[PDB]
Amino acid sequence: CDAFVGTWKLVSSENFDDYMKEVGVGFATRKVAGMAKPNMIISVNGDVITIKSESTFKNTEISFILGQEFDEVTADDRKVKSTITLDGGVLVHVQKWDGKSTTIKRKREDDKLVVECVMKGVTSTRVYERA
């Protein structure tokens, strides 16, 4: 994951409120979470990948091994079971909770890190650049 490593800052978002609604995030959380302009900090140490999000809303940190399920408490306070794989150069993060599922894909595109969040038919695109 060398081309993902580093510190990234959110520079644009599209359809994130709609994604959050599809996920089931409530009003107040959507409004405060939607304002945030997080940094995402990605590091690797052996087989362990760490993705931290720092924002004025809700700091988060996950550490994981590719293909190995883990517990995650998301920023909106879902308790999910997550599995992250690297498929064709794209980090693919599946979250399962309450019989539901959402997939977050992270990919490098030019000098950007593009984050696509999909819940059913709804996609949000979040673009990060190096901090």
UniProtKB/Swiss-Prot annotation:
Pfam families: Lipocalin. CDD domains: FABP4. A fatty acid binds at R126, V127, Y128. It is found in: Cytoplasm; Nucleus. The modification Phosphotyrosine is found at Y19. The modification N-acetylcysteine is found at C1. InterPro entries: Calycin (IPR012674), Fatty_acid-bd (IPR000463), ILBP (IPR031259), Lipocln_cytosolic_FA-bd_dom (IPR000566). Keywords: Acetylation, Cytoplasm, Lipid-binding, Nucleus, Phosphoprotein, Transport. The modification Phosphoserine is found at S12. One of its GO terms (cellular component) is cytoplasm. Lipid transport protein in adipocytes. Binds both long chain fatty acids and retinoic acid. Delivers long-chain fatty acids and retinoic acid to their cognate receptors in the nucleus. Forms a beta-barrel structure that accommodates hydrophobic ligands in its interior. Belongs to the calycin superfamily. Fatty-acid binding protein (FABP) family. Monomer. Homodimer. Interacts with PPARG. This is Fatty acid-binding protein, adipocyte. The gene is FABP4.
